[PDB]
Amino acid sequence: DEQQSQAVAPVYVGGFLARYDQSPDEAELLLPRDVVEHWLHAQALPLNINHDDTAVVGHVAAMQSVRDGLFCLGCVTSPRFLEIVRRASEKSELVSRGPVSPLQPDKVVEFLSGSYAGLSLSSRRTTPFKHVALCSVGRRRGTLAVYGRDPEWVTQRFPDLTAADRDGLRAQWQGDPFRSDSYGLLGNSVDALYIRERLPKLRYDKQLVGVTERESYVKA
Amino acid sequence: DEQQSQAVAPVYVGGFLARYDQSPDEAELLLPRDVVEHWLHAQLSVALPLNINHDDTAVVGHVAAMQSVRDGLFCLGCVTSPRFLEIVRRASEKSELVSRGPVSPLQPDKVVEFLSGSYAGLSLSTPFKHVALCSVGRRRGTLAVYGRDPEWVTQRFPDLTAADRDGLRAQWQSGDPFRSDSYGLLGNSVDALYIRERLPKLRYDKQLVGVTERESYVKA
Ligand SMILES: *[C@@](O)(C(=O)N[C@H](CC)c1ccccc1)[C@H](C)NC(=O)[C@H](CC(=O)N(C)C)NC(=O)[C@@H](NC(=O)[C@@H](NC(=O)CCCCCN)C(C)(C)C)C(C)(C)C
């Protein structure tokens, strides 16, 4: 179908796992710069959906401790998951509405942006970093997830990131591990509809990291 | 086995398809008393359909009865689609929210609970084309209530009276109309995530109807 093949091509996601200049909503969420660097120094991390270990869609391509926090670049690859995503997008009035001004329509990308707008990192206090999860909203703030086809392009979606930053990241990115089904994704969709302060929180995150959404596929 | 057949049993729902004591913060619609009365009373009366968010290819059943009452229009529909229910039941097995179950002495009912969190609201589309189950309604006091026994659900709403229940009750006493699929509902899923102030709205209709000061399956 050609098209049905462009869609199901890998999709990168990027964003902060934690923003240093931000005090967690809970003590457990404490993750200071000092800890991060020591950890990264030691400890490929899995990329799943809502922490469900039975819904791994790809892997983490890069982790980096920049200035304002910890930043990762993940890659979605699971053709099983991507297909479903392609199927669902086809029936989303949001996706159908298209993206902002000069950006070209990418249903599978847009749908994930609308669906898992945040990034949640599984940690401990071998390998303190368990995995990264795409979710409707991170528990930490500034964890907006940004989806795009070009990894270079998703990185350029964050002002705080410097040329030096992308250097260290580029020097990182350069079968189907999924195990759930659409029914599963569906069930997860309701849990998402009852998270308090979601959209407000998502918006707060945008402003916090500069993703105007008039430059990305962010839907909040 | 066995219970899965019990869950895939028909489900009832009801609520105000309009609140007379309410002014649409968005005119357009308009429900004024004399209207409906004049409108319901017309033409027995042909089967009104029930669909997910107006998707004529996502029919789940029919409205079983409607009645003009003390504070607005109130309808009790019946969700029957063996195909629709089957999905909702597999999705339910994969929902943390549903996993946590109901309150105080209410027994668990995944299928009911899933619908409860997914289509908290009722929407009215002969003038009355169809009633639709959706994540929320533009017209306030649209909060939907799922139950296995109609009388039970009616019993959830205080404003109602034996009198009212009389008429309603007097009312509810082919093939699989559903045409959509899990991807379809999934697709509608994100669209829902973007309705501004869904919960705060939802919570409102909860007290606006008194269902807060009682026990139900409402997840709001
Ligand atoms: C993340 O943003 C998130 O969970 N978001 C979700 C999206 C649905 C969300 C939740 C509520 C409201 C809105 C959104 C958030 C930053 N991450 C977590 O909360 C994360 C979840 C997780 O990993 N799982 C659910 C598996 N939690 C953690 O990473 C925590 N890690 C642990 O608790 C680890 N525990 C230990 O290392 C010792 C446990 C000792 C037990 C007794 N022996 C572990 C093994 C469970 C990963 C914290 C790092 C936050 C503590």
Side-chain angles (χ1 to χ4, degrees), chain A residues 28-29 50-51 120-124 130 135 137-139 195:
Chain A
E28 59 179 305
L29 292 178
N50 255 64
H51 297 303
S120 183
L121 162 72
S122 182
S123 298
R124 56 153 299 174
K130 314 303 178 55
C135 56
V137 195
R139 281 214 296 158
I195 295 175

Side-chain angles (χ1 to χ4, degrees), chain A residues 52 54 83-85 87-89 91-95 97 111 113-117 136 180-200 202-203 219-220, chain B residues 55 57 86-88 90-92 94-100 114 116-120 135 180-199 202-203 219-220:
Chain A
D52 188 312
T54 91
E83 182 39 35
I84 297 181
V85 165
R87 291 254 273 191
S89 63
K91 281 287 207 67
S92 168
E93 191 47 53
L94 183 62
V95 185
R97 259 186 288 298
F111 180 83
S113 304
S115 187
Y116 312 95
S136 62
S180 181
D181 52 301
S182 75
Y183 297 108
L185 295 181
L186 220 206
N188 179 55
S189 110
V190 290
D191 303 333
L193 286 163
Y194 292 89
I195 295 175
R196 184 175 162 190
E197 332 293 18
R198 179 167 174 289
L199 288 189
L202 254 348
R203 293 200 279 279
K219 292 310 188 65
Chain B
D55 226 297
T57 64
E86 174 51 0
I87 304 176
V88 170
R90 292 160 72 149
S92 59
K94 297 298 301 82
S95 160
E96 212 64 49
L97 184 68
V98 177
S99 178
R100 284 192 300 276
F114 189 84
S116 293
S118 297
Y119 316 110
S135 57
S180 194
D181 70 346
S182 68
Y183 302 104
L185 301 161
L186 221 197
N188 193 319
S189 184
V190 286
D191 290 354
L193 293 167
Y194 285 95
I195 286 181
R196 281 264 186 167
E197 296 294 59
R198 187 185 55 276
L199 265 21
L202 244 25
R203 293 201 190 67
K219 299 297 196 168

Side-chain angles (χ1 to χ4, degrees), chain A residues 3 6-12 82 85-86 89-90 94-99 103-114 147-150 153 217 219:
Chain A
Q3 174 57 179
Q6 283 193 304
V8 178
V11 188
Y12 291 92
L82 279 171
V85 165
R86 213 264 315 159
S89 63
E90 224 60 83
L94 183 62
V95 185
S96 195
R97 259 186 288 298
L103 278 187
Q104 60 187 48
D106 195 306
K107 295 199 173 190
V108 172
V109 161
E110 295 178 58
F111 180 83
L112 300 162
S113 304
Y147 299 99
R149 299 288 182 182
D150 176 4
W153 184 90
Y217 290 90
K219 292 310 188 65

